[PDB]
Amino acid sequence: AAWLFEA
Amino acid sequence: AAWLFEA
Amino acid sequence: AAWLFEA
Amino acid sequence: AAWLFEA
Amino acid sequence: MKEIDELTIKEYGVDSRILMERAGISVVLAMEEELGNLSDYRFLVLCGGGNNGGDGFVVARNLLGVVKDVLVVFLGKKKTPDCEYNYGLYKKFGGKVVEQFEPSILNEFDVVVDAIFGTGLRGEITGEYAEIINLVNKSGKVVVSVDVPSGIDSNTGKVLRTAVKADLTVTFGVPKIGHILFPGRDLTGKLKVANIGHPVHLINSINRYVITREMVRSLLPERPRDSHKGTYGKVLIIAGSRLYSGAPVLSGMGSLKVGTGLVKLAVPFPQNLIATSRFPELISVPIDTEKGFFSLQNLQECLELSKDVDVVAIGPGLGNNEHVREFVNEFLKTLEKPAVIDADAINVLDTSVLKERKSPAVLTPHPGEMARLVKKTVGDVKYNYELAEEFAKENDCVLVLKSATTIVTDGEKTLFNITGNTGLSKGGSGDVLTGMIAGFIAQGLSPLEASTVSVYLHGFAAELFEQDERGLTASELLRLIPEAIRRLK
Amino acid sequence: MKEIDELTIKEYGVDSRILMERAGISVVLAMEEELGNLSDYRFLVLCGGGNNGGDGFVVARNLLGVVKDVLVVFLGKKKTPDCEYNYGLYKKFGGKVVEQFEPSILNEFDVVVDAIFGTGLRGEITGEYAEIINLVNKSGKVVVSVDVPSGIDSNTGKVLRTAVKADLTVTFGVPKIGHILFPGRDLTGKLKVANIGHPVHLINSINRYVITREMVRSLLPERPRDSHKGTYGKVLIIAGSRLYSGAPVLSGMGSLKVGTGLVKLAVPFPQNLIATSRFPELISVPIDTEKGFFSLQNLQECLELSKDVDVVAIGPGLGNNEHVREFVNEFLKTLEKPAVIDADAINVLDTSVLKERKSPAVLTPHPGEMARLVKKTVGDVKYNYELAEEFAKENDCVLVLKSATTIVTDGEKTLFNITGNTGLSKGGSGDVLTGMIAGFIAQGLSPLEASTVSVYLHGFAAELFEQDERGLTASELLRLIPEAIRRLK
Amino acid sequence: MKEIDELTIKEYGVDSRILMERAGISVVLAMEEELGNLSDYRFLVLCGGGNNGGDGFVVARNLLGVVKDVLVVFLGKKKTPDCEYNYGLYKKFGGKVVEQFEPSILNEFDVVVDAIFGTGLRGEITGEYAEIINLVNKSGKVVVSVDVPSGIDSNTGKVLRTAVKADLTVTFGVPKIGHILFPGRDLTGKLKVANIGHPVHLINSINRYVITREMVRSLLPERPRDSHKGTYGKVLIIAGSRLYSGAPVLSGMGSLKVGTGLVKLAVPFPQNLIATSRFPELISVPIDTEKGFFSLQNLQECLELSKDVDVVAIGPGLGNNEHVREFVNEFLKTLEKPAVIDADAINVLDTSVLKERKSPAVLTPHPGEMARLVKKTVGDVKYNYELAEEFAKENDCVLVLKSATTIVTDGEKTLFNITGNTGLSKGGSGDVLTGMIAGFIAQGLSPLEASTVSVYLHGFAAELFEQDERGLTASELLRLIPEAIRRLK
Ligand SMILES: Nc1ncnc2c1ncn2[C@@H]1O[C@H](COP(=O)(O)OP(=O)(O)O)[C@@H](O)[C@H]1O
Ligand SMILES: Nc1ncnc2c1ncn2[C@@H]1O[C@H](COP(=O)(O)OP(=O)(O)O)[C@@H](O)[C@H]1O
Ligand SMILES: Nc1ncnc2c1ncn2[C@@H]1O[C@H](COP(=O)(O)OP(=O)(O)O)[C@@H](O)[C@H]1O
Ligand SMILES: Nc1ncnc2c1ncn2[C@@H]1O[C@H](COP(=O)(O)OP(=O)(O)O)[C@@H](O)[C@H]1O
Ligand SMILES: Nc1ncnc2c1ncn2[C@@H]1O[C@H](COP(=O)(O)OP(=O)(O)O)[C@@H](O)[C@H]1O
Ligand SMILES: Nc1ncnc2c1ncn2[C@@H]1O[C@H](COP(=O)(O)OP(=O)(O)O)[C@@H](O)[C@H]1O
Ligand SMILES: Nc1ncnc2c1ncn2[C@@H]1O[C@H](COP(=O)(O)OP(=O)(O)O)[C@@H](O)[C@H]1O
Ligand SMILES: Nc1ncnc2c1ncn2[C@@H]1O[C@H](COP(=O)(O)OP(=O)(O)O)[C@@H](O)[C@H]1O
Ligand SMILES: Nc1ncnc2c1ncn2[C@@H]1O[C@H](COP(=O)(O)OP(=O)(O)O)[C@@H](O)[C@H]1O
Ligand SMILES: [K+]
Ligand SMILES: [K+]
Ligand SMILES: [K+]
Ligand SMILES: [Mg+2]
Ligand SMILES: [Mg+2]
Ligand SMILES: [Mg+2]
């Protein structure tokens, strides 16, 4: 889930 | 259900 | 729900 | 769902 | 219904303001039922000068202080006494009225209440009225029409130049014909019928009805446990030709699917063999013909076959040539059984024969067949209930004039059917209905009752189709009939 | 509300018949909502001669032809103009009226509509009226009362000799005090309040209200994310004694459970240690006393502790002897902070001190404490809202008079609380409410707002108890408070 | 991060336009994730003259032909080269730009993209800029801020006169301090951090971090199966007084709930007995004191008790008077164990003592305690990370400066905690954290690690409370700690 965005 | 409205 | 009756 | 990818 | 209002006021003594109040609150309750909580919405109420507009002022007034915003645009140039009284109330309650309609005004509102014209509409809508109605139709707002969508003739369902297309219509006392017949049926959207206090005896004195589930349920014949096929009657179907070999099969199964005990088809050889290869429960009697069509040489054999049945259906796929004409008319003149007359039997019918017959008849034309039968245009006859009534009365028959809304009349009582969908707009569907009607007659219902139950069930079976309606065929419709019957109880 | 009707007629111009029509149909709709389809039931409508009876005639008339049976028993000896008009309609519509009530008549009916007396009741019910009401109460039929159950005084909720016990009461415009206060609250059964068309501005001009979920939700203080305990205030509770060591603990946690930042208790040593052994989140300051009770020797220390807080609650478990009296009165005379005054602090209070105080106060008596405070009988003060109003106004305070319906007034605005159940009828429950009120004051609500939110939440927490209410104790109530808060949004 | 951009361009060779492109598409993808399909929405993009505005032009351009409507309002008076390039693209792609902001323009749009100012903000916002930002804040539209909401200082989180309140903020590379500290944390709304292509080595070279779940999970000490209480360390807590008898209990259980093997409290008699009446797992040693407070006469006994433990926590509820001051300072000067120093031990601390100590320390002040400790105003110290850093470095300690965002620093590394809620804004919650920190030190974590894990877990336990947060008390928080630990893996 994490290549583009960190939550 | 039916005193006021018929469907 | 509320035009005619308040509970 | 559709800005980047069309299926 | 206009007589109903006036008797309720003048003879029962209900103040006309009381009726108008009840009408307006019915609209508010109906809208709540349909939109949920009203308090979020902004309402634009379009009021004419008549009592439809007066009902609108009642609506507007009862939304004050409870919804996000209300505005009345008053579009008339004088007010009836009750409209005037209710305008005065709306204003005393703090309501805003304007008399100029501004195109951009639609922007600031979520719901349009259409109280411009009701049953008092007379003539084509023009001028500002037409412009305002066209603006509302282009607006994509939620539209609630009071009594009838403005622009529909409430007696015929015709559009008078232009009309409002409503999401919801709230009408009073009883449905109006213009809600039931197209195009008006389409412009009505969802219809609610509100009780506004007329005495029940007056509401029930109306002689034109919508066929309802409860009426059909009470007409369904009984199935006593100690029975046999003869309990449930016998049908003869005289149908088909070398050109039209499928019609007999669809009519025959139509009678068997509604619970008839026995069905015999008389069809030209070898086409008769088509029926039992599909449905071996059918009896399909081979008729020897010269050229693949019924003629006078088959008269005696058909009368003979008629002796042992309760009802005869005639016409589907007979073809229309002179020898069929001779045969059909001489047959019906001598047949002393109820007759269901469809399709090519109507195309060649001499209506004098219906007057001579002692036995009953049902005729099942679509508007093209009715037009040819009475020598008028399709446009003259379509949805023409009064002509249908006159015809049934003059010819001592039941007339079932087929269309998306089907009319069933014996001249005294007229019923309207609103079940069905466009899956029935495909060859074969009429043939099935013919078998259904004959079947119910054979089971003991009157011609009028049989017709009433059949048109409803036929349309409701179409609605039970699982996939898209446009792919419904007559064979699938047949399969659905018993599910329609089950759901009806 | 009688002024509301008359302004709506005489100044807004709504015909009195329109109001009466709307009242009667409201009753029919309410009954349908509660009983389902009406068509199976037989209705006995008991009509007096006034406008309550007139509303009943409207009910009766609107059931004609739709239900199994309707009968009106007319019990008056003359009819108001609107009752007369509506009687005439019922009869023109084919309705049956009798004037003799026969005991056995209850047998043939399922529902009794009680339209004998509404707000026009004056004096004790006697004679045939009383007999008929007692017969209905013994009958085990479903009872629907129009406006107020006949026999309840709508201003006080008292029973006038005898009254109808209703399953459902439909009232118009606003709830009446007699629906809210006992015994009337009990005889009302389920209450529906119907909108019958009064302008909203008049309905909102009433100055006595039922505390509702929405009102409490809008009063709940905010919890900004960037906060710390000081954001949410500080409470000092002066409470307890060698006899009553538990009261401080219940009050203290009452303030913490509603979201107060810091709570300090001042309690006689060693009883102060009881609090932190239960709830170590509390600060429980030991007060050196001569004999286990607060006295004048503790005055200076308590004022000192008051300097660093936002509100002081005083009274739970202090005991009532002369040295407590001296201390409480001198303390309150010098305290320059809002004060919540409960229990033994009310028992020893000199009311002159409330007049001298510049700072605000809330008093939280039950009727026995209120009775002693004003030197009247419990019966004189219980549910006596006007005396409560007068008291709050004369003493510049908020008065919270506790009972199953709690009254909260500052003399100008009066609110009624109807949450809670008999689980709160047990020692300790008042102590919790005291902490809740102080807490909300510390969080920034006015004395009146804090009292309003607290009485509602306190009663609603009691209703959330999972087991039988009679086993609810104060400690469990404490645990439920945050669930009540969560459900309130 | 400004250095990060410039190294990525000048030394790694990534064209500045590539970074800006990636930034803008990140915003589009983020919005889609949050709003669903974009094609229904109308977008108003507010662009300044700098690179924040340049990112906005990229957003606008990538929405052309895909959404219902896009309009850029350009609010600057000259454009940086990359903003100019991207403005040119937006226009070549058919985009509409206006330079006058019209109040009513908000009406015709669903989403406001705020690309006015990013990290290039300097000084108070005034004039048209302020007016436009206030108009957007009043509008109730969905607001998406590019990089940082315009008006937040990205270094401090302060509002520069006025700032945008965003529903969603998309920032690039790493979170900025102004997203993490209040008020900016509140105005940021939901924060997404987008990878726009900086080398990972540069992104990881930042020395200030948000404490994350993964970091806390990797720091949790092991629980080898073959263990006993001594494996998991021993804590001494020196706490409480005759005034504050609850503090010791909350600190003690704080250490036991995070998995410490043994906890001993030293508390003045008889207050020590309070702890074991609640939690008999605790050892609560009675200390004989003259007046209910620790003093120099207890020094020798406390050092003796310190011999057999791994860590000493001191301060909660000690009170602040001269004899406590003498005792605390002489104790800490001689104690040769790690010390966790909280509450009144900070209030009386001589900071020279921290410089003399060979053993480590953690200090856990809220801003009022930090203010008194360094002789500044609360406003000077709150959220002042650089002062915290300087303090930790000068005094050779770890400083945990408590607030809704907690800062944890040893002078070299600074971490920010964003777990927790307003339920912790209530006395007792700090006492629990003190026990947690000491516990993790006893288990073998460094002072900095222990502090990092504790602030996170403490806040996350608060979030696990089942009911409304405002009713959370310290005792409930204690119960939630082990659930927080379980969820963390
Ligand atoms: N075609 C039309 N164009 C313009 N105005 C019309 C038209 N038809 C009717 N009206 C006006 O609208 C009035 C009332 O309509 P409606 O309210 O339905 O009648 P009623 O008052 O009988 O209920 C008519 O009496 C007439 O003056
Ligand atoms: N529901 C209907 N509405 C209008 N016209 C109809 C309808 N059904 C049939 N018609 C008319 O009748 C004609 C088709 O009928 P026809 O060819 O005589 O018999 P069939 O089509 O059943 O063999 C069409 O031209 C059509 O205008
Ligand atoms: N759109 C529609 N909605 C409802 N019923 C329809 C529709 N189109 C056709 N029908 C019904 O289907 C049947 C068509 O019969 P007919 O017109 O005799 O066609 P066919 O002769 O092709 O078998 C009639 O019962 C008619 O009422
Ligand atoms: N206690 C009583 N006993 C007998 N009759 C009463 C009593 N109280 C009131 N009534 C009668 O009932 C009438 C109307 O009651 P109601 O319908 O509530 O009044 P209104 O007509 O004001 O609405 C009174 O005006 C009175 O004549
Ligand atoms: N809700 C109530 N309704 C009627 N009376 C009450 C109520 N609450 C308390 N009382 C009266 O007060 C008395 C008990 O109060 P009291 O003993 O003075 O204080 P407490 O019971 O709180 O120690 C009872 O005799 C009772 O009549
Ligand atoms: N039956 C009941 N229904 C609703 N609330 C009740 C009931 N009985 C008691 N209460 C409430 O409980 C609390 C009792 O307080 P108080 O009478 O001071 O008792 P105590 O002093 O014993 O703690 C009040 O808030 C009262 O309104
Ligand atoms: N307080 C302010 N008021 C008005 N304009 C400002 C203010 N602060 C900054 N600006 C303008 O906005 C420009 C760019 O902001 P931003 O796009 O965040 O910078 P960068 O171009 O470094 O990314 C600044 O260089 C300046 O000209
Ligand atoms: N998170 C915080 N933000 C701002 N101020 C704070 C915070 N926590 C505490 N304070 C300040 O410190 C004061 C309360 O602290 P103090 O009374 O010295 O210790 P405690 O309240 O823990 O006994 C308040 O006046 C408040 O301004
Ligand atoms: N609104 C909030 N959000 C997150 N954490 C909070 C909030 N308010 C208080 N806290 C946390 O709760 C604890 C309060 O500690 P302290 O200020 O020492 O209070 P106390 O001394 O009353 O026990 C700190 O860890 C602080 O970071
Ligand atoms: K209309
Ligand atoms: K009554
Ligand atoms: K921005
Ligand atoms: Mg046909
Ligand atoms: Mg009490
Ligand atoms: Mg603290």
Side-chain angles (χ1 to χ4, degrees), chain F residues 52 114-118 145-146 148-150:
Chain F
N52 201 242
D114 155 40
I116 304 173
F117 307 122
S145 287
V146 178
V148 290
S150 288

Side-chain angles (χ1 to χ4, degrees), chain F residues 119-379:
Chain F
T119 63
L121 178 68
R122 297 290 184 275
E124 306 282 289
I125 295 179
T126 41
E128 299 183 356
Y129 287 110
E131 267 173 25
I132 294 178
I133 286 163
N134 301 328
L135 291 158
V136 174
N137 290 346
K138 281 180 181 64
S139 73
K141 302 310 179 177
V142 172
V143 184
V144 178
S145 287
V146 178
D147 211 18
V148 290
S150 288
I152 294 310
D153 180 335
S154 65
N155 301 309
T156 65
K158 283 170 159 219
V159 165
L160 305 184
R161 197 171 167 260
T162 201
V164 166
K165 183 170 195 335
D167 297 290
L168 171 72
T169 298
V170 186
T171 195
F172 314 119
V174 293
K176 319 286 179 280
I177 293 182
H179 302 129
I180 295 160
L181 302 183
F182 289 97
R185 193 177 150 195
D186 213 57
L187 295 195
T188 291
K190 191 184 290 204
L191 183 72
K192 304 202 197 268
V193 181
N195 162 28
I196 64 162
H198 301 101
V200 175
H201 182 280
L202 288 179
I203 294 305
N204 296 340
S205 70
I206 289 166
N207 230 311
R208 299 211 178 92
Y209 320 104
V210 178
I211 299 160
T212 63
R213 173 181 228 103
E214 324 78 56
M215 171 188 329
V216 170
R217 189 170 77 267
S218 67
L219 292 172
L220 264 190
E222 285 183 55
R223 307 288 297 188
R225 289 204 289 157
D226 186 22
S227 55
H228 56 93
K229 66 178 171 299
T231 313
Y232 300 115
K234 295 175 197 149
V235 169
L236 175 66
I237 297 173
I238 296 170
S241 66
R242 67 190 295 271
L243 305 176
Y244 306 117
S245 58
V249 189
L250 294 173
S251 294
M253 291 304 308
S255 303
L256 286 174
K257 294 296 206 156
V258 301
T260 318
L262 191 62
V263 183
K264 281 181 137 125
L265 316 178
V267 181
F269 180 75
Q271 287 72 35
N272 65 298
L273 290 176
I274 291 306
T276 54
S277 76
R278 274 256 48 199
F279 293 123
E281 303 92 315
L282 287 172
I283 293 171
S284 190
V285 169
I287 302 299
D288 189 16
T289 67
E290 215 69 314
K291 314 235 193 195
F293 303 87
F294 282 95
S295 72
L296 274 177
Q297 91 187 11
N298 302 121
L299 175 58
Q300 192 51 51
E301 176 168 17
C302 290
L303 292 170
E304 200 69 21
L305 291 169
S306 287
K307 293 180 184 198
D308 314 285
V309 304
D310 301 300
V311 57
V312 181
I314 187 164
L318 290 184
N320 166 8
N321 58 57
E322 268 298 314
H323 297 129
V324 174
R325 179 180 303 274
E326 291 163 14
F327 161 84
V328 164
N329 290 298
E330 279 301 309
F331 179 73
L332 291 168
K333 173 174 138 113
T334 317
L335 179 67
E336 298 198 312
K337 299 278 152 120
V340 178
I341 301 161
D342 188 27
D344 286 316
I346 304 171
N347 292 330
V348 305
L349 188 59
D350 176 358
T351 62
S352 323
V353 154
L354 294 173
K355 307 177 162 71
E356 297 161 36
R357 287 181 40 83
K358 314 302 224 210
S359 282
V362 181
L363 276 67
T364 67
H366 62 61
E369 287 160 347
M370 184 65 190
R372 282 187 299 277
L373 187 64
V374 300
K375 302 200 142 283
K376 296 188 205 261
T377 67
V378 168

Side-chain angles (χ1 to χ4, degrees), chain G residues 2 50-53 80 116-125 129:
Chain G
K2 228 293 201 56
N51 290 343
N52 201 242
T80 59
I116 304 173
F117 307 122
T119 63
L121 178 68
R122 297 290 184 275
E124 306 282 289
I125 295 179
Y129 287 110

Side-chain angles (χ1 to χ4, degrees), chain E residues 250 423 426-427 429 465 469-478 480:
Chain E
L250 294 173
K426 198 188 273 80
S429 66
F465 188 52
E469 75 195 52
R470 79 191 76 193
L472 179 70
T473 58
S475 288
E476 294 305 324
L477 177 77
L478 282 170
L480 296 160

